[PDB]
Design a binder for this molecule. Structure first.
Ligand SMILES: NC(=O)c1ccc[n+]([C@@H]2O[C@H](COP(=O)([O-])OP(=O)(O)OC[C@H]3O[C@@H](n4cnc5c(N)ncnc54)[C@H](OP(=O)(O)O)[C@@H]3O)[C@@H](O)[C@H]2O)c1
Ligand SMILES: NC(=O)c1ccc[n+]([C@@H]2O[C@H](COP(=O)([O-])OP(=O)(O)OC[C@H]3O[C@@H](n4cnc5c(N)ncnc54)[C@H](OP(=O)(O)O)[C@@H]3O)[C@@H](O)[C@H]2O)c1
Lengths: 324, 324
């Protein structure tokens, strides 16, 4: 079998496609013939050797994959069945998606839903699944299209792009925040009602003027701090990222004076039930047009190059990896 | 009529009980003969001139009151009716409850709930109403007694005492955090199962060991930051306070890695349906023993002295003001 393999020569990560035997695969009760994977921000860090994502080498990266079951000892899954996986430590501490074959716990798999192609599941990937979870968080908080504008940060990215399209489809007025001017036409076509510059969110008072009924944040750090200060009374922010930094230098004022909810969204260990629900919602809520707009398809050996482009913020939308 | 009056000579607030004519009260549809009020942290800030709570002088402070309607131009209220009020800006921008009479909008009043005495309504006051809103937030998040331990910070105070008593009644295992060894017996008597020192909430990593299914925070600052770092995956913190400072020096990690919810709770502008629900729940969920254990009854003339004690963290439980 072939696989993208991370090894460490002199402490610096080297990535290259290599042949290896199925016998080397980690233990698990389901074996999957992988047809598609993707590159997420976390995959890019893993591949660039940045971020301390990988604590064991050599490692097959890729926190995502979709394919067909080769063999299964889990009674929920049968040989030939179409399945997908995102998260659960896969591609971090367990051999990953960017390989022709993977062996995992059946607990980590999701049956490919009726209404979603294996290829499109990967275009969504971890990033899109996370966006769906964020949207469901706003809904849980009672945030409706009629309540006001929803703001999306890091909007041109994988999570951001998906969130814009989901919110647009669901009827919300969407404001997209982006540090790049080249992404504007793209963002408008995704459904953004207006585009705002990243520099507009540098520093804030504890409370700013109320602007947002809802927010989906991929940035963290000072951007998230300012969004919080700008939330309408009873607004909700769904936070999932740290593209701008992991710190959260905020105050309790939006919370105790404006009754704001900050809902954290984790994709790695999302419970099976909510996980299944998110995938079913994606079938319903993501327009077929999104898949053509947001995706760039690459081959396995091109991953390191794109990993680099992702870290340097030189891409927009989602990176789909054909594994075949 | 008699009322506690706040005036500032030169950037400093002066508080004294004075006699005034009823005709000096602000305009409003409902005139109430006040029988009870209370002192909350916010009232103590107002009365001591700290916290920029009052921007208009002279002011009659007191964000709570309970009494009997003398006259009403509002068709929802009638002469002789028992009513209570918390919040709505009363005691901040509108002459408030620390007086023999108050005049207010019908919208700000709550008919005295069946089963609740006027005196007990004020032992509860804003502090207890807030604790109830915090408990309801944990419930909204699906935090059940079987799910794990709930921590209450600033536990010996007004909101904290009520919170401990409510959670205890509802069947939770409760941990109380206090910076005063002298409050431990009192906290145990309210139903706290575990008592921890505030000293243990001074430094923290972005993620600490997972300890709490839920939390009710009245302190903010570092204590809140560490509580966030200690939340179980999917845990919820209901935050309502700033006794320890208004800053929130935290990181996105508990949110994006552990799916934590931080729900802000405001008592001031709580809409009528939720506000009515909270009062109904309080009547049901606070044991009779609570009113006896938590309350210290003072007269209006004692208010300034007690406001000092509150700000100096030299009181425990709830301060009840007999106005009648
Ligand atoms: N389980 C989880 O909570 C989970 C799951 C998926 C993703 N994430 C996190 O969510 C974030 C987004 O992931 P992704 O895969 O969408 O990433 P991405 O496509 O690589 O980029 C996200 C966007 O963030 C913006 N950005 C990048 N650097 C920035 C900076 N220094 N300051 C402000 N904005 C910056 C860029 O948008 P613009 O150029 O338009 O400004 C970029 O397109 C990442 O931090 C990722 O690790 C977490
Ligand atoms: N969100 C809202 O609409 C609203 C409504 C009501 C109350 N509040 C806020 O909630 C908080 C509690 O109100 P309350 O009436 O219960 O006040 P309280 O009776 O004074 O309780 C505050 C408690 O915090 C602890 N504390 C005091 N100073 C501290 C410090 N410097 N560092 C760490 N802990 C400290 C003390 O407990 P220990 O001695 O046991 O440590 C004290 O009992 C206040 O900040 C108040 O403004 C907000």
């Amino acid at each position: 079998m072939q696989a993208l393999i991370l090894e460490q020569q002199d402490g610096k990560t080297l990535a290259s496609v290599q042949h290896l035997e199925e016998s080397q695969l980690p233990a698990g009760d389901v074996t999957v013939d992988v047809h598609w994977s993707s590159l997420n921000y976390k995959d890019a860090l893993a591949i660039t050797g940045k971020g301390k994502i990988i604590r064991h080498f050599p490692m097959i990266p890729g926190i995502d994959f979709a394919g067909t079951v080769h063999a299964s000892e889990d009674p929920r899954f049968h040989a030939g069945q179409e399945v997908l996986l995102t998260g659960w430590g896969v591609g971090e501490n367990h051999w990953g998606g960017l390989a022709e074959r993977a062996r995992v716990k059946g607990d980590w798999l999701v049956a490919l839903p009726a209404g979603l192609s294996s290829r499109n599941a990967m275009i969504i990937g971890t990033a899109g699944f996370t966006a769906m979870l964020c949207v469901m968080a706003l809904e849980d908080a009672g945030i409706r299209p009629q309540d006001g504008e929803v703001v999306v940060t890091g909007a041109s990215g994988g999570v951001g792009s998906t969130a814009v399209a989901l919110l647009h489809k669901l009827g919300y007025q969407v404001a997209a925040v982006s540090g790049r001017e080249s992404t504007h036409g793209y963002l408008k076509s995704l459904g953004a009602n207006r585009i705002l510059s990243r520099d507009e969110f540098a520093e804030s008072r504890p409370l700013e003027k109320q602007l947002w009924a809802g927010a989906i944040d991929t940035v963290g750090d000072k951007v998230l701090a300012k969004v919080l200060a700008q939330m309408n009374y009873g607004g909700c922010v769904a936070a999932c990222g740290l593209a701008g930094g992991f710190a959260l230098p905020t105050t309790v004022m939006p919370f105790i004076l404006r009754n704001v909810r900050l809902q954290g969204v984790d994709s790695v260990m999302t419970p099976p039930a909510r996980r299944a629900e998110a995938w079913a919602r994606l079938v319903k809520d993501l327009p077929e047009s999104f898949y053509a707009q947001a995706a760039t398809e690459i081959t396995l050996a091109d991953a390191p190059k794109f990993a680099d482009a992702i870290i340097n913020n030189q891409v927009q939308g989602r990176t789909l990896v054909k594994i075949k």
